[PDB]
Nucleic acid binder design. Structure first.
Ligand SMILES: [Mg+2]
Ligand SMILES: [Mg+2]
Length: 198
RNA sequence: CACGGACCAAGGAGUCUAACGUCUAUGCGAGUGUUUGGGUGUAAAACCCAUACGCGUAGGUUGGGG
């Protein structure tokens, strides 16, 4: 999967675009495609990471930050790792969501602000997110590339949902400032993106 | 900047007393302390007497402040 383009704008298979009368694939057929989509995602994206590790100056300096840096520096480094290649670096996306969940209010707010900036940079579509089972033209003849893309869309929808969970728990925080900031982030997302608007 | 933080009001981790001794000030001085009692008293007082016992007593030369 190319990294130079936002992963929604990457051209899908043509078979996605003239398949509206396709028979409903059974759950096993959807499950196998969902699995095959998964293995292709944590496939070459690793090889992309292996290519990334070849640059020793780039890997070492960032690994030092990801290991020894402060929370703000780590949040930044993780945010960039997602901007450069959001599709490939599911590990950094998971890591970012993990900072949002800690007991530390200041850092969790910073991490969630970083996620909000990532979401509201156009990374999320103009349209809503689709689950893997709800993708159009879901077929056995779909290529690995498009299949990985659909799996990543399902994964990112789950990511947004767990981010909403983190918002909900934090939105009831006793501290007034935390509640106000969470409210501001919620209304920013609601105004500027369609995902989970309800 | 690095690290932590429901909210307001309060409250919030033990006592009197003894024995010996150094120094200083005051009174007296081989004395010193009374009050153990009494008198007296514009009355715990203040002023005064004894009454005992306690603790005390029982040269040579050189230098030498003066
Ligand atoms: Mg003599
Ligand atoms: Mg002489």
């Amino acid at each position: 999967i190319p990294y130079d383009k936002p992963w929604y704008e990457i051209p899908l298979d043509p078979q996605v675009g003239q398949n509206d009368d396709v028979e409903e694939l059974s759950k096993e057929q959807i499950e196998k495609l969902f699995e095959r989509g998964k293995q292709t995602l944590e496939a070459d994206n690793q090889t992309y990471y292996e290519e990334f590790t070849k640059d020793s100056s780039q890997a070492k300096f960032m690994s030092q930050i990801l290991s020894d840096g402060t929370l703000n520096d780590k949040i930044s480094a993780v945010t960039l790792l997602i901007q450069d290649s959001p599709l490939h670096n599911t590990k950094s996306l998971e890591t970012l969501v993990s900072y949002c969940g800690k007991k530390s209010r200041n850092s969790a707010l910073q991490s969630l602000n970083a996620l909000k900036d990532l979401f509201l940079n156009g990374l999320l579509p103009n349209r809503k997110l689709r689950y893997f089972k709800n993708q159009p033209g879901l077929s056995m003849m779909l290529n690995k590339k498009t299949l990985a893309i659909f799996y990543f869309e399902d994964y990112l929808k789950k990511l947004f949902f767990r981010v909403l969970e983190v918002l909900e728990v934090l939105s009831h925080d006793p501290i007034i400032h935390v509640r106000l900031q969470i409210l501001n982030h919620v209304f920013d997302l609601l105004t500027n993106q369609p995902e989970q608007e309800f």
